[PDB]
Design a protein around this nucleic acid. Structure first.
Ligand code: MG
Ligand code: ZN
Ligand code: ZN
Lengths: 112, 161, 84, 167, 57, 90, 50, 43, 97, 47, 171
RNA sequence: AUAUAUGCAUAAAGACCAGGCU
DNA sequence: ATTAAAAGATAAAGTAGTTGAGCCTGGTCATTACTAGT
DNA sequence: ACTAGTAATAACTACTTTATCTTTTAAT
């Protein structure tokens, strides 16, 4: 009961639905694109815009609040980003199953 | 046409065609393009879900970036602030991706593209799973093995238990 | 639809230990939150003791909703469940 | 804060384009669709209240509230004073002042006649019994619902609206 | 090992820095007094206090 | 470089909540002084890249005793090196 | 085999009904066991009978 | 039931004891000491 | 530091039948946290500003069908890591049936 | 330093100074890098 | 505009009010918290009907708090703006940058771009008004408008109307 | 028309390794 | 009538997971050859 | 004409899989 008041109704989770994150969904849930390898600008605080520690991703200190939600580190749950890959990459946890699909469908017409 | 036989070698899929036969590498792009042509009925009958679990989503083309709460900032000694293993791994992955892009816009010595792409795939795999059998695991800068998300999840000292 | 009629209830008419503990805790919390008391208070000051006194006299205004495995439920008043 | 019977509609792989509201295309959104659900979940037609019908139902609801509160005892100010709360009181006086001046049929006998005469999208009957119509051209120009029906007969219905109902 | 290894007791405030136990509850706890350390948890609500008093006593 | 000195709120930041009045002008507590827990025994300040912040090591929170010995010397690099030995009775 | 089961669940689009005790514990809810195997209503009739 | 079965295991020619309990629980296809008890007719 | 309530303690509480005590021990005496979820995607991508009372979901363009949940912070971290590993655990407060 | 793994650990330990006997016992200690109850038994040849 | 809707509300009752008059207190809470409010999905709520004997159902005792949760289902009358719907209104303020009009509790703003060029604002008129050849729009004059935009702030609805079509104007 | 700012009264290292305790 | 073709049973071998609870203490957290300031 | 940042340099039990086998069937 120590949390700040919210107008959203409070209930409990009744069902958990699992699945895979589509690229469209990944782009939609993201708030910033990460493309800059560097972290600092010239080492005077103010992290790189679009970097791995963009302020839009979230807040971890009381000095600066989150630029997306507007709350402090005690309430901000963190916000995700997206990074575009030049080439497609296999998923290590899905290496065998994909191969099994390769043994089910055709490699030209994509039919069973 | 005649289907090929697919074998697994490390993080690679070797496709051999019995015609002597011809062995080639199954690039993720071709497999993703083939998977994108699966009809919804065939996807349903393959044990997948049209709405939730589509097969071509199994291949990564865009990488989510977790907030800094997942990878909290560390400070090795007072004022100096270090980075977690996840931060360094994401930095290495992004460096590999920008290397791929900047060498693709330049000339094309195909072997160089292949080996850089394999390095990027290895980095992504070790980000997702550093306990891959059959190949050496990725080492952190200090020499210790990189703590991947899989190591964080499983185990007695892991997240769940 | 999911409710079961009063004349068709098949569950036991006794109060289980878990039900007794849950009712005692809920009544104690409600009394501590300034709720009306249906029994006289002579010398006791613990809300748990007041809840136990109310339970002994069968005056607790709560209803147990026992859930069958299929999804249907039976509603039993606290004034009709036998307390040992 | 409040919720209705229609809900669910979770995320799907393919997005839907027809989401925006437009009365010209006779699209009302998922909340006000053709079919709604009652307490028992049975399908029911959408209920649209014309300004005269709305006036009658508001007067009935206010008199029922007066019976419930005062107990068996006429003016817009009195009906506004029946309810409590500054926001609610302001809203009710505003809607009564908007509705009494623009109510075409302010009497119960004409309301019953319209019931019968009215006796088809409910938006069409609501807009016919809501805003004044005198010519077919202006009736179809104001809202294009009457323009494309393929069973129009606007001459006779507008003659009825002008003579049998209140001119 | 079993449910008898975690039971609800009544607090008696005493001097010195050791938990005091009746000798008859050592066997269900499988404990002796040669240097054993034991843990105590305090409920923070009326419902859980009633649950401890009526179920785990 | 870090400095062994008694820190003050006027020129040092991030001071601990413990007692700093038991220190001398060199930032080291004199031997033979009875001390309780959560008290500063060695006072060290480090500059920032209020130009200094506190880095003093306090006593253990659940430990009391009497300062028995204080040793000051130099390390391999050439800076100060302090060892404070405290004695208590069980 | 936490990660393998989770990956299989993600690939197979499995649905968890949250009827067991483990997933109720990890989600910080009242598990449907012991005192949580029912719900407590309010006796309107007896309160009115006062 | 699980606790009441596991508790005696802490305290404690065919295989017997903890190895036999583990062999039973794991459903081993190969038995360390296979045996059959054969009963004959009354005569 | 704080004492550890291990798996065997959880088993003992399950055997005792004290669900409320276990819930309070693992939530109120530990990392309780409040999160916001969307009633469409089911994902934890809802941007919430309680100072000005604005709830929004970028993906599903939702601003009304948004709920709040009380969950352990470790559960939040697990869900975020699963999202980072291209897995989408959707928390729904209603049974589709 | 580079090969932290695949190397014997615990060869050198901090000397115990709790008491004289403990110090002597620590100075006269042998260990086997095996980390099977066969090697843990007291063999007859240990006399 | 005026529609009939089926709504459900979740109401929390403190244990201090657990008395024989709790049904009337829940009814009073419903009457206070439904009418006069606005929602994005439903629009402005006009009022509720048959609220004297509405079924409050059975309460839900929240574990760990002791308050009772009631799900009250009711039939109400609401008001919701529509895109492209023409409506009659009475104007309130007239300014060169535009003029406002009232449709129930809703305020609809018409910008100067959406008045035909025949009507011209004149500050010299008493009251200030838009006049044209046999055309007059003062404050408090009946006008016809067409809604060409709606936007929600949870608490209120804001709408913009246009009179740039045939058979639209003062009546 | 104000007047400069020349200022800041708590931040939480965590992960591995080794040796012991019942 | 009898034996080449081969689809399929299945025998044999390669691979992979995983190990009782908690509690305390102390120690560590690289390295050096290339290229720019004064 | 010299210096210091500085960045890159385990057995036990189980399942699964593969190739071998071969028996089987229709074809020589
Ligand atoms: Mg002992
Ligand atoms: Zn935020
Ligand atoms: Zn959403």
């Amino acid at each position: 009961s120590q949390f700040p008041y919210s107008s959203a109704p409070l209930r409990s989770v009744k069902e958990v639905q699992f699945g895979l994150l589509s690229p469209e969904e990944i782009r939609a849930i993201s708030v910033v694109k990460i493309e800059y390898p560097e972290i600092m600008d010239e080492s005077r605080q103010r992290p790189r815009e679009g970097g791995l520690n963009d302020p839009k991703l979230g807040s971890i200190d009381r000095n600066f609040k989150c630029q997306t939600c507007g709350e402090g580190m005690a309430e901000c749950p963190g916000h995700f980003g997206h990074m575009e890959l030049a080439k497609p990459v296999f998923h290590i946890g899905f290496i065998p199953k994909i191969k099994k699909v390769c043994e089910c469908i055709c490699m030209n017409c994509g039919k069973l | 046409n005649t289907q090929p036989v697919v074998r697994k070698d490390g993080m690679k899929l070797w496709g051999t065609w019995k015609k002597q036969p011809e062995r080639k590498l199954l690039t993720p792009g071709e497999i993703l393009n083939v998977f994108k042509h699966i009809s919804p009925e065939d996807c349903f009958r393959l044990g997948f879900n049209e709405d939730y679990a589509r097969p071509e989503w199994m291949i990564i083309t865009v990488l989510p970036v977790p907030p800094p709460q997942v990878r909290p900032s560390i400070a090795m000694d007072e004022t100096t602030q270090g980075q977690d293993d996840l931060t360094h791994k994401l930095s290495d992955i992004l460096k590999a991706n920008i290397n791929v892009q900047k060498l693709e816009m330049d000339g094309s010595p195909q072997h160089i593209i292949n080996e850089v792409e394999q390095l990027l795939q290895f980095h992504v795999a070790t980000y997702m799973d550093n306990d891959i059998a059959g190949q050496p695991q990725a080492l952190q800068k200090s020499g210790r093995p990189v703590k991947a998300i899989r190591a964080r999840l499983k185990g007695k000292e892991g997240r769940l238990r | 639809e999911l409710a079961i009629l009063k004349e068709e209830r098949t569950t036991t008419p006794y109060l289980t230990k878990y039900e007794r503990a849950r009712i005692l805790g809920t009544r104690a919390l409600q009394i501590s939150m300034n709720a009306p008391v249906l029994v006289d208070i002579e010398g006791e000051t613990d809300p748990l003791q007041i809840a136990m006194k109310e339970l002994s006299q069968r005056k607790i205004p709560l209803v147990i909703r026992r859930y069958l495995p299929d999804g249907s439920y039976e509603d039993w008043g606290c004034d009709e469940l036998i307390v040992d | 804060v409040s919720t209705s019977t229609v809900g669910a509609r979770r995320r799907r792989a393919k997005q839907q384009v027809d989401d925006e509201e437009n009365a010209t295309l006779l699209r009302l959104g998922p909340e006000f669709a053709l079919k709604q659900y009652d307490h028992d979940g049975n399908e029911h037609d959408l209920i649209a209240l014309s300004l005269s019908e709305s006036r009658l139902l508001i007067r009935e609801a206010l008199k029922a509230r007066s019976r419930a509160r005062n107990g068996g005892v006429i003016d817009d100010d009195e009906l506004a004073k029946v309810t409590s709360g500054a926001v609610a009181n302001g809203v009710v006086k505003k809607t009564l002042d908007y509705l009494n001046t623009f109510a075409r049929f302010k009497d119960e006998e004409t309301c019953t006649a319209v019931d019968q005469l009215l006796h088809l999208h409910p938006f069409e009957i609501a807009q016919l019994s809501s805003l004044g119509c005198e010519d077919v051209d202006e009736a179809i120009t104001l809202i294009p619902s009457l323009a494309a029906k393929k069973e129009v007969n606007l001459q006779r219905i507008l003659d009825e609206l002008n003579r049998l109902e209140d001119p | 090992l079993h449910k008898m290894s975690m039971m609800a007791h009544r607090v008696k405030v005493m001097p010195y820095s050791t938990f005091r136990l009746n000798l008859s509850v050592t066997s269900p706890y499988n404990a002796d007094f040669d240097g054993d350390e034991m843990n105590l948890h305090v409920p923070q609500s009326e419902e859980t206090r009633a649950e401890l008093s009526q179920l785990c006593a | 470089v870090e400095e062994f000195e008694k820190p003050t709120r006027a020129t040092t930041l991030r001071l601990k909540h413990g007692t700093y009045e038991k220190l001398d002008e060199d930032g080291l507590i004199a031997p033979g002084v009875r001390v309780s827990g959560d008290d500063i025994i060695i006072g060290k300040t480090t500059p920032i890249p209020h130009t200094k912040r506190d880095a003093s090591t306090p006593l253990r929170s659940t430990e009391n005793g009497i300062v028995d010995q204080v040793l000051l010397t130099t390390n391999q690099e050439g800076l100060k090196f302090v060892k404070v030995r405290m004695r208590t009775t069980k | 085999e936490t990660v393998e089961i989770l990956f299989e669940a993600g690939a197979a689009a499995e649905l968890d009904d949250c009827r067991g005790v483990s997933e109720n514990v990890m989600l910080g809810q009242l598990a449907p066991m012991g005192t949580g195997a029912f719900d407590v209503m309010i006796d309107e009739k007896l309160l009115t009978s006062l | 039931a699980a606790q009441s079965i596991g508790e005696p295991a802490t305290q404690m020619n065919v295989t017997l004891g903890v190895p036999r309990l583990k062999e039973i629980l794991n459903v081993a296809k190969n038995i360390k000491t296979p045996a059959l008890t054969v009963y004959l007719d009354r005569e | 530091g704080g004492l550890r309530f291990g798996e065997m303690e959880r088993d003992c509480m399950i055997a005792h039948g004290a669900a409320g005590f276990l819930k309070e021990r693992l939530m109120e005496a530990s990392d309780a946290f409040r999160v916001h979820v969307c009633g469409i995607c089911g994902l934890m991508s809802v941007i919430a500003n309680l100072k000005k009372n604005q709830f929004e979901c970028r993906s599903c363009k939702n601003k009304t069908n948004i709920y709040q949940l009380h969950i352990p912070y470790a559960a939040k971290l697990l869900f975020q890591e699963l999202m980072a590993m291209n897995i989408a655990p959707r928390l729904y407060t209603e049974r589709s049936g | 330093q580079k090969k932290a793994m695949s190397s014997r650990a615990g060869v050198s330990q901090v000397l115990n100074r709790y008491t004289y006997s403990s110090t002597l016992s620590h100075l006269r200690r042998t260990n086997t890098p095996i980390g099977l109850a066969k090697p843990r038994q007291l063999h007859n040849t240990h006399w | 505009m005026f529609f009939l809707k089926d709504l459900s509300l979740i109401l929390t009752l403190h244990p201090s009010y657990f008395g024989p008059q709790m049904n009337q207190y829940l009814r009073e809470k419903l009457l206070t918290d439904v009418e006069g409010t606005c929602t994005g999905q439903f629009g402005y709520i006009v009022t509720v009907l048959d609220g004297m004997n509405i079924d409050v159902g059975k309460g839900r005792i929240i574990p760990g708090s002791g308050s009772a949760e009631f799900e009250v289902k009711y039939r109400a009358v609401v008001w919701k703006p529509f895109k492209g719907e023409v409506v009659d209104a009475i104007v309130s303020n007239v300014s060169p940058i535009g003029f406002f009009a009232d449709v129930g509790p809703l305020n609809v703003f018409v910008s100067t771009r959406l008045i035909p060029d025949n009507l011209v604002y004149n500050p010299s008129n008493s009251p200030p008004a838009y006049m044209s050849n046999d055309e007059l729009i003062t404050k408090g004059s009946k006008v016809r408008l067409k809604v060409v935009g709606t936007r929600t702030d949870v608490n209120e609805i804001y709408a913009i109307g246009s009179i740039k079509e045939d058979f639209l104007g003062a009546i």
